[PDB]
Design a protein around this nucleic acid. Structure first.
Lengths: 590, 89, 618
RNA sequence: AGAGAAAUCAAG
RNA sequence: UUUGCU
């Protein structure tokens, strides 16, 4: 590790990219996820009271509590209603033009949203087939079920989809005609349970953690409301300087890094992450914040009901427990659902509903990212906190500019306390304040003085995508160029990545050594003229964006006869991608 | 979708990886190498594009220029630009 | 009193064109009408020689009649048009609506030119007009919307240009009952509590005076656990030829006898190797199952262990708890680091150079060439090539279910063409249904030296080829397909050390304002104490070796350790600059680091390296 | 046996 | 399933 700590030429911040092993295989999660899911579900209740009382905390509907119950030494799970109201009002009053842009989105963009965009999400657990299916098929099935049970043609607009859902929910019972004609029945309670059931799954390939953690997805019946709320959150977040949303992070971080006083004040840089970020928030606080925003916006009442419905359904959620907890009887091993045998999660046995567990507090990762970020950001608004703040969901960096060290420490503790106030706990061991400011880390970007190194979380897969030679070359060069101009690779590393990708791409298409393709080209005297044919590369660091065929033609490496043979549209081999069609644009069988 | 990415090397090395439409301009065998498969679109091997590049049916240069105009514009724009003395600082 | 993008004459005319105070909207109506007339003026400002168009609205009916008589058109009184192109003799009304696409035909008398609120226009209308006027209209409407949002008139403007909206959502009664089951508030929450932010008594922030120490675990030294070997990898040199010829040559001249037998890899398993080699010499990498294969690839071991466990079913069910066996930094990590940076007589990184067209291209290619020359002739490069070849050949045989033993030789070639047999990888009978399934492998490799404590589970045999002696280590492994694919392109490990080298060289060039691609200054590091630094080339080589080992030993422990060590690296950097590090209440980053120090020998090596550095800066 | 890590493969 | 990335 001392080898990664330079003391000359460069600094440890420069070598921060060495503290990465993404070139190795990412870990995977094995077998049952029930333990992780139950731990995530039980964490909120153990933190609600300073003295862990899970049973007493299992009856709380709205996770609201007085400031006397907020644990300032450990994680807290509740929220302060009055604090949430006042902070949301302050956020509205500060970023008023952002509120105006949100109102424009609501009064113009929101009505025209098309429900087809709902078919671009994770695999959905159909409430009829009882098995996960891709998003488009699940959307089609849900739409057909709605039309069959309502006897109407649901309009293309997304609000029509949401109103259709809210109407079917009024039906005392529903039926679905399968298609293979098999009938399926639903009681109002059964459909309500299906809609409020979140299906869990391991988060695979997640680097940077020792323990595997799960994620959850909602049903297709409530995904419309979730999309509406998330789009509104994105629209508001795009117009605030405190957000970490995928915005011009270079400009934002450079602007905050340049911030300095007249050299007499005290500057501090606090880099941190929130602990149990999802496992402490309460949807009631989120919906109250949204309601405050909308009411201050002068929005109609049906808009507020539409925005509140998804959080209401999330409050009465049902988390899928997976397969069960593992038990051993001597040398055997068996999975058993919670309830049959004693376990550390016995307190939650009363919440079991079939194979799903009911929980009102807490949240699951991967459902409300932008709303959680908004909830975190509203906390920062108050007179005490006069510093800058950037938040990307669970990561955050704050810049204090105070008159004295005492004011800086008071502001830091006030920031921590306010986050606790809205239900967000900064991981004390993961929070570090440097004074004077100048050194920090945030969103895998490491800032030192006036230099921000954007360390890539993952290396680009420097291999062909598998579509076809021309498309693969174009995509790979584009990926390398994007990773270069984002600061993740300088010119030398960009050229090296180009060479590595070139070698991998040539190998994948049998052009590097003695193969069937090269043997055929040698026997019949087919001089290699393209990169995938074995010809020397024509692209360079400066020409990573051009197309290979045009570049070769301009440089004289391709002749009019070869171009006419290659670019003949009558060849039987024919099928952002800007590769011109050619005989080398074939399609693989399987 | 990493599935095609991890299947390319195996896919390319299959006996008949390429799928192409039937066409008599592609011979059954050339110099002792089987090109197309008359299985019950048809299937061809990875050497078919190279054989075409060497012996395909040439098209009019007008079609080539029409196809390549968009990318040649960018190539010419790049090569026409003049880059000043590279600095260090 | 007026937007900065509104002129005076148009403003005064709009104020006097109608009685705006008797309508629902007293202000925004004037603004939108002025916007329409300003668009008309801007479009009519341009010319071909005559002006492109001409303003018609807001003028007396006399000119309307004159134009109708002359310019071959008729204009009624109800909805007077605004624009008319004489070059095309077509009448257009430039109306702006919020609906970018939905433009219902109000009338079929003439074509209608509907424009978006943000500047856009219809689907098949902007083509007729030129480009500059479209850009002007876009900019004007963008500025209009900017002013509207600045003055909080979004809803008023939407009402003005869209009439009135409607309640497009409603919630039933039973659905409300369902929704209000698990929350104390109604669908529209109205907590009857005055908004207020209370004051909470927190805890003070402690200073980090000294950097923490990482726990060093005790127990058996960690043995080698990578897929293949590292610095202890060798090869047999064979005459040039195909893989089949090289394997046949190896098989013909080979007397294999066990030196050291491990219980995990019984010596009988050697029969699975030779029988495979022979088959690969005859042109059939896939071979029929034999008796020894059962032990080699754990065939039916699932049922065997199921029965051996059910035999002890007399007991009570207990919550299955797991224990990961702690282990200490084995002594072979430093030896591996030393041997990985040893020199080689050949360059093992032969990547085709890119083309050079620009000075930047030349500089980049020079930097890459220098880096390859620096790290190309090291043992680590040869081991990387061996790993990549082995992983590729093994992963290419996992795309179809197979109940027969496959042969995947590890053979490279020197520039002269001589074959280099690093070893062999036999793939057992596999049925790949999930991409994360563990395929069974019997991996044989050529070793340089054998250590029982380092390779406890390997069986080492002697191998005599034309007099020359070699050690052949056999290991019964089970490896994931995903990890095999990841190692199939392990060549990416060369990027990070390349990043460090290029950054150092470019920093020196900037400081001197003149690139020197042959500079290797002294890098001061916290070394044992005998020396106080290293050259840039040696440091790059050491970084490459350590990064290769980290990639090979990348598991959740390594990921967590590296993720949680960045905080302490930043803290050390801050202390080195005489900055101050402050911590919240009950903070212990060292605990987060220590949670991930259990088994990984490379993690233990890095932790020991961290502990050796000074933990106080004065 | 083995791979591995908080629980799964070593077929069905 | 025929076997050649320094």
């Amino acid at each position: 590790m001392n080898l990664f700590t330079p003391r000359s030429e460069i600094n440890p911040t420069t070598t921060q990219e060495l503290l990465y092993a993404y070139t190795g295989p990412a870990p995977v999660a094995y077998g049952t996820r029930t333990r992780a899911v139950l731990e995530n579900i039980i964490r909120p209740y153990q933190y609600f009271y300073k003295e862990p009382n899970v049973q007493r905390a299992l009856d709380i509907k709205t996770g609201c509590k007085e400031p006397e119950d907020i644990n300032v030494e450990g994680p807290s799970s509740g929220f302060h209603t009055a604090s949430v109201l006042k902070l949301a009002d302050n956020f509205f009053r500060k970023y008023r033009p952002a509120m105006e842009k949100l109102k424009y989105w609501i009064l113009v963009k929101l009505p025209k949203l098309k429900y087809a965009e709902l078919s671009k999400g994770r695999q959905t657990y159909s409430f009829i087939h009882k098995r996960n299916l891709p998003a488009p098929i699940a959307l089609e099935e849900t739409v057909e079920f709605l039309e069959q049970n309502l006897r109407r043609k649901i309009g293309p607009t997304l609000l029509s989809y949401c109103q259709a859902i809210a109407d079917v929910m009024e039906l005392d019972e529903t039926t679905y005609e399968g298609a293979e004609t098999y009938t399926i029945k639903f009681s109002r309670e059964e459909l309500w349970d299906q809609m409020r059931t979140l299906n869990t799954m391991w988060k695979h390939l997640e680097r940077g953690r020792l323990n595997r953690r799960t994620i959850a997805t909602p049903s297709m019946l409530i995904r419309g409301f979730v999309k509406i709320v998330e789009d509104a959150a994105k629209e508001i977040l795009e117009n605030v300087p405190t957000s970490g949303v995928p915005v011009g992070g270079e400009e934002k971080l450079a602007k905050l890094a340049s911030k300095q006083t007249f050299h007499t004040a005290v500057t501090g840089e606090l880099s941190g992450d929130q602990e149990k970020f999802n496992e402490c928030l309460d949807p009631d606080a989120m919906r109250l914040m949204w309601t405050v925003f909308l009411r201050k916006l002068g929005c109609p009442d049906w808009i507020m009901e539409l925005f509140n419905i998804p959080f209401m359904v999330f409050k009465s959620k049902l988390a899928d427990m997976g397969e069960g907890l593992v038990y051993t009887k001597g040398k055997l091993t068996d999975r058993k659902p919670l309830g049959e045998m004693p376990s550390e999660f016995d307190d939650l046995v009363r919440n079991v509903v079939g194979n799903s567990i009911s929980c009102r507090l807490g949240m699951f990762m991967g459902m409300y990212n932008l709303t959680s970020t908004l909830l975190a950001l509203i906390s920062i608004e108050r007179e005490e906190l006069t510093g800058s703040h950037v938040e990307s969901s669970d990561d955050f960096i704050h810049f204090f500019n105070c008159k004295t060290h005492e004011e800086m420490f008071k502001q830091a503790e006030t920031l921590r306390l306010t986050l606790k106030l809205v239900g967000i706990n900064m991981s004390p061991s993961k929070c570090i304040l440097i004074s004077p400011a100048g050194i920090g880390e945030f969103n895998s970007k490491f800032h030192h003085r006036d230099f921000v190194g954007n360390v890539a979380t993952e290396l680009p897969a420097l291999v062909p995508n598998g579509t076809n030679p021309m498309t693969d070359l174009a995509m790979g060069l584009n990926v390398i160029k994007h990773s270069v101009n984002t600061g993740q690779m300088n010119l030398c590393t960009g050229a090296l990545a180009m060479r590595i990708f070139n070698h991998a791409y040539k190998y994948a298409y049998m052009a590097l050594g003695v193969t069937r393709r090269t043997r055929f080209m040698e026997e019949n005297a087919i001089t290699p003229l393209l990169t995938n044919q074995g010809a020397s590369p024509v692209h360079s660091f400066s020409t990573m964006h051009l197309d290979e065929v045009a570049l070769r033609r301009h440089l004289g490496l391709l002749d009019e006869e070869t171009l006419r043979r290659i670019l003949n549209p009558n060849n039987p081999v024919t099928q952002e991608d800007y590769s011109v069609p050619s005989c080398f644009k074939y399609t693989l069988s399987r | 979708d990493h599935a095609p990415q991890m299947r390319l090397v195996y896919s390319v090395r299959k006996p008949w990886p390429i799928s192409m439409t039937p066409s008599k301009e592609i011979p059954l065998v050339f110099n002792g190498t089987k090109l197309k498969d008359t299985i019950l679109r048809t299937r061809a091997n990875i050497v078919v594009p190279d054989y075409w590049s060497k012996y395909g049916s040439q098209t009019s240069l007008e079609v080539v220029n029409a196809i390549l105009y968009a990318e040649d514009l960018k190539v010419q724009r790049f090569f026409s630009t003049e880059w000043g003395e590279i600095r260090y600082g | 009193d007026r937007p900065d993008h509104i002129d005076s004459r148009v403003w005064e005319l709009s104020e006097t064109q109608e009685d705006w105070i008797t309508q629902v909207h007293g202000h925004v109506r004037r603004v939108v009408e002025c916007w329409k007339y300003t668009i008309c003026c801007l479009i009519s400002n341009m010319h071909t020689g005559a002006p492109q168009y001409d303003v018609f609205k807001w003028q007396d009916r006399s000119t309307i009649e004159w134009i109708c008589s002359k310019k071959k058109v008729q204009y009624p009184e109800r909805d007077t048009p605004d624009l008319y192109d004489n070059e095309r003799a077509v009448a257009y009304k430039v109306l702006l609506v919020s609906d970018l696409s939905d433009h219902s035909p109000t009338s079929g008398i003439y074509h209608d030119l509907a424009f978006n609120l943000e500047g856009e226009a219809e689907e098949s209308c902007a083509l007729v007009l030129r480009g500059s006027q479209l850009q002007d209209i876009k900019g004007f409407l963008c500025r209009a919307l900017e002013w509207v949002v600045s003055n909080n008139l979004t809803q008023e403007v939407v009402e003005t240009i869209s009439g009135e909206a409607k309640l497009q959502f409603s919630v039933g009664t039973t659905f409300r009952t369902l929704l209000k089951r698990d929350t104390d508030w109604d669908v529209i929450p109205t907590p009857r509590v005055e908004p207020n932010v209370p004051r909470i008594e927190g805890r003070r922030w402690t200073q980090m005076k000294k950097l923490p120490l990482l726990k060093e675990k005790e127990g058996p030294p960690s043995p080698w656990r990578a897929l293949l070997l590292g610095a202890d990898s060798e090869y047999i040199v064979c005459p040039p030829g195909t893989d089949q010829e090289a394997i046949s040559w190896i098989h013909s001249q080979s007397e294999i006898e066990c030196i050291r037998e491990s219980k995990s890899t019984p010596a009988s398993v050697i029969t699975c190797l030779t029988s495979s080699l022979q088959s690969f010499a005859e042109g059939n990498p896939v071979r029929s199952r034999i008796h020894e294969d059962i032990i080699a690839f754990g065939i039916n071991k699932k049922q065997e262990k199921k029965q051996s466990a059910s035999s002890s079913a007399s007991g009570e069910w207990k919550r299955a708890e797991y224990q990961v066996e702690e282990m200490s930094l084995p002594p072979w990590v430093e030896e591996e680091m030393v041997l990985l940076r040893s020199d080689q007589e050949d360059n093992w990184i032969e990547l085709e150079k890119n083309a050079i067209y620009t000075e930047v291209d030349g500089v980049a290619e020079g930097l890459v060439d220098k880096y390859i020359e620096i790290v190309g002739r090291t043992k680590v490069a040869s081991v990387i090539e061996k790993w990549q070849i082995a992983a590729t050949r093994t992963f290419s045989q996992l795309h179809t279910d197979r109940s027969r033993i496959t042969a995947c030789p590890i053979i490279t070639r020197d520039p002269s063409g001589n074959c280099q047999f690093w070893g062999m990888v036999l793939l057992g009978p596999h049925h790949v249904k999930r991409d994360t399934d563990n395929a069974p492998l019997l991996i044989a490799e050529i070793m340089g030296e054998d250590t029982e404590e380092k390779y406890p589970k390997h069986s080492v045999f002697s191998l005599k080829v034309e007099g020359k002696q070699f050690l052949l280590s056999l290991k019964i492994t089970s490896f994931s397909r995903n990890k095999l694919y990841t190692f199939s392109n392990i060549r990416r490990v060369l990027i990070q050390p390349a990043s460090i080298y290029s950054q150092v060289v470019l920093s020196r060039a900037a400081e001197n304002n003149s690139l020197n691609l042959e500079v290797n200054p002294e890098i001061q590091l916290y070394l044992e104490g005998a020396q106080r630094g290293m050259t840039l080339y040696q440091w790059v080589r050491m970084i490459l070796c350590l990064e290769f080992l980290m990639a090979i030993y990348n598991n959740p422990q390594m990921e967590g350790f590296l993720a949680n060590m960045r905080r302490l690296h930043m803290s050390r950097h801050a202390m080195m600059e005489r900055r101050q590090v402050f911590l919240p209440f009950g903070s212990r980053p060292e605990d987060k680091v220590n949670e991930c120090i259990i088994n990984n020998p490379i993690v233990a090596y890095l932790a020991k390296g961290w502990n050796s550095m000074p933990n106080v800066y004065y």
